[PDB]
């Protein structure tokens, strides 16, 4: 099945939000199949925002990123990155619907409290990236009731 | 007041869904007049789908919700056959917004958890298809802080 | 498995605690074996109070559970008669611990919600009265991470 | 920073919302910065409405809320204004979003539960409007977590 | 019917506790006659306190009380001074139930949230101490379903 | 400050509950220092169950807790350990109280959920059978709320 990567981010840690959002993706149905605190590497950070490297704003993404303990995850289930996201909400927490999680808990574009993988394909990179394939699940069992 | 029919079917019983389900429409103002759990015999599965008779996955929609216990309930008040289809979602649960209940707790068409009627028209047939007229509420008193 | 038998009265219906109440037991992990909604009838009620005949309080318990309408329902599970008790508090509200229903949401030993079988003996007896054979579950299938 | 006014209306008072009104906004980070519960006077009512003075519905407008308690409050934090609304919902709560206030909670556009300030122009003036400037927070300390 | 006074404490407002707070007495059925939010003056906290006066504790306790914004609430309905005392646990959090309010939410006895009356002879004088007639509500209305 | 270990077991991770369960010592304001999903080693699982070698239920605490994934976690705070044991609940979950963990959740002595360390002794040899001294945390913030 799919899998996506979501890290809660310090921000998200430091304000005792990490349950509340593990508990949202449990509800839903998706299986966790890796999960880890850590404190990222400037290394780690870098890599994981290779792709904003150009623009001026990416050495705060890696500063805020290692400023403190993050949380890392990977959530396994059919259609997780897309899903995942769409439970997240936009950028701007302000924007963001009533009932996802930047909707529900943030305010500011720099502390969104949450990220996850853009699509399939960067899913698949940063699973790599930030776990080692002895950390994830190999036999994942979801809920029979869930999946036709 | 309008009346409407919602089956929480077996995925949602099996999960353990039907009080956060009921409490929803409790919240929302909504005054449950007739409820119980039953398993669906053949016949009435097939009169509840038979908008869906003509179409190859008819016999599919058949065997699951006769496959275990339903919850079978109807709500009144203003709006409620359309306000109660908000409030599950979409045919897709993937696609399903956070806040709804097949957008928090579902991922697959097959296991949707709960399903509302169409239209006025269709809550009258299916009403009268799931529940004896003495199995509902004839006075309702609803919260006198809810309509003006 | 053991069976209890708990009406929730015409207050905690009134009141809109149906769904918060079932919701309770369903993460309990007991099972949902029968569940309907109806206004009793006198002679079901003063069977129900049948303990209670010699003092004079009986005449008001028959009037209040009469008096609106009441969701029955039956749960299976190991020691569910004493857990179930365990789960609504004491008599009086009031002292009832945070935590149970009772300690949660009612204030008068006259409006205290919900009742609950005493003894695997009035369980059996309660179930019998309000219940049908048919409107029973017969094959009950628990979540399997629940029992050794 | 910006700040809004939001007025928990009699009906959302009498219908015990309060508290879980409140702790949305403080789970989303924005600041408690003046809160009294207070039934307001005609001369008030009049002109916290006066936008809809030519129109005939003023007169229900100021009669209801007028009518029992409400609780007053001002939130201060990043885009208030706005985020504030889009965490109520629109004017008719059927049409309004599950996961909204009047989304998961109310029923008629006439007992809406909630009302928020239009814009930041109309806040100023209604926040001088139902506090002193002695009952409103001088200095602010926001969650550190909340603002890059 | 008996009132009592409850103030959530400096650490309370800034952990965002106070919605949480109302919201459970809210369910449990009291009613709210009385909210306001203020910056304790050191006057006001010698007086509270005033049980302390001899004991070396009393400057902190009265230190911290005018340290930031305290919301200041009275609850009126029956034996609400005892059971507001239940519902908030013990002196220490530690060793207060889980399912209380300092039972769930604190660790420290100086910082447990929440304070309410001790009887309903202190409840009076409590409430005279914090609040202006005309700031509490004289036309109470619980829900019916509340009280035989 | 004191350190304790949980594990959320088997049927707690299969049942979705750790995020609620983490959500609930993030709430009491507990800092966690440690957070990893593994499948126990056999050579781990007898360690950890060293205390019951003798007896002859030894062997099935150890078949369980390898039979599946366990997330490991070691939270600190003041007086963590026996606070972390008073809001798991006691032994037997039908014995254990409304508003605990195992008193809201489980049902079976076999199937009980979460274990947390005994003691303080107990609980530094714990994290350094399942921890690795770079997997946890040295600077630890915690509200500034929190404590006096």
Not at 81 to 92: P, Q, Y
Not at 102 to 110: P, S
Request: include cysteine.
């Amino acid at each position: 099945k799919e899998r996506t990567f979501l890290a809660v981010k310090p921000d998200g840690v430091a304000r005792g939000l990490v349950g509340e959002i593990i508990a949202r993706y449990e509800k839903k149905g998706f299986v966790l199949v890796g999960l880890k605190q850590l404190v990222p590497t400037k290394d780690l950070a870098e890599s994981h925002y290779a792709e904003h490297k150009e623009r001026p704003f990416f050495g705060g993404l890696v500063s805020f990123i290692t400023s403190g303990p993050v949380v890392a995850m990977v959530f396994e289930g059919k259609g997780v990155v897309a899903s995942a996201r769409l439970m997240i909400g936009v950028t701007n927490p302000l924007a963001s619907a009533p009932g996802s999680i930047r909707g529900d808990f943030g305010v500011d574009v720099g502390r969104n409290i949450i990220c996850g993988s853009d699509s399939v394909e960067s899913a698949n990179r940063e699973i790599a990236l930030w776990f080692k394939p002895e950390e994830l699940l190999t036999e994942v069992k979801p809920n029979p009731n869930l999946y036709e």
